Structure 1
């Protein structure tokens, strides 16, 4: 599946090179710019536990997911991964627990030591 393909082919985009955040570009975006810290970012996404036991989508509200990059409004893996994306890009991310919810998890929704997968479309970003 998509998650295994990321395990096998996915670029390690962590600073520490600990394979905590693996990325595949699935559709190339436009222009050179990628968002900066503080930028307002607009995305569509689908997400799941790698266990496929819980599945979440912005599509479920028909409306984009909006957050400020690098403020830790989202898990660390997103601040890291969406920062590498161009406008219009779709990427797959596979995420170890250290860059998601950790040993504590986020129960009852997310268990301890959970690996997460997302598909993310970067719709737009705009400055603070």
Structure 2
């Protein structure tokens, strides 16, 4: 499925090049601009554990998820990944625990050493 394709063909977008955050562009966005640290970013997403029956989606609430890039509301992988995206882009990210909830996890929601998969659509971003 989608996660396996990211493993096999995804680009490593980490600085350390440790394959901690792998990305496939599923739909190319518009223009050249990508968001700056501090920008408010508006997305739709679906997320799941790799090896789990936990699934989460913005589409359930039928409203975009909004956060400030780099301000710490979301996992490191999201700060790294969303910063690479253009408006209108859809991407798949596969994420090792070091860039998500680590060895500890965050129970009950997130277990120890969980790999996460997301599909993210970057709808818009706006400066502070």
TM-score bucket (shorter structure): over 0.9
Q: Secondary structure at the match of 1:81?
A: helix
**Distance in 1, Cα, partners of 2:106 & 2:117:** 16
Q: Separation in 2 of the partners of 1:94 and 1:72?
A: 19
Structure 1 residue 73: Cα displacement:
1.0
**Superposition deviation, residue 72 in structure 1:** 1.5
Aligned-partner Cα distance in 1 for 2:100–2:60: 22
Post-superposition Cα deviations, 1:12-44, rounded to whole Å, max 9, x if no partner, equal 000000000000000000000000000000000
Normalised TM-score (structure 2): 0.99
Measured in 1, the distance between the counterparts of 2:112 and 2:51 equals: 12
> How far does residue 97 in structure 1 lie from its aligned partner after superposition?
0.1
Structure 2, gaps ≥5 residues long: none
* Structure 1 partner of 2:102: 102
Q: Which runs of 4+ in 1 moved over 2 A?
A: none
**Matched residue count:** 128
Q: CA deviation at 1:53?
A: 1.4
TM-score, structure 1 as length reference: 0.99
Structure 1: runs of 5+ lacking an equivalent:
none
Q: Which residue of 2 aligns with 1:27?
A: 27
2:69 equivalent in structure 1: 69
How far off its partner does 1:71 sit? 1.0
Question: Could you say what the CA RMSD is over the residues aligned between the two structures, in angstroms?
Answer: 0.5
- Residues 1:119 and 2:119 are matched in the alignment: yes
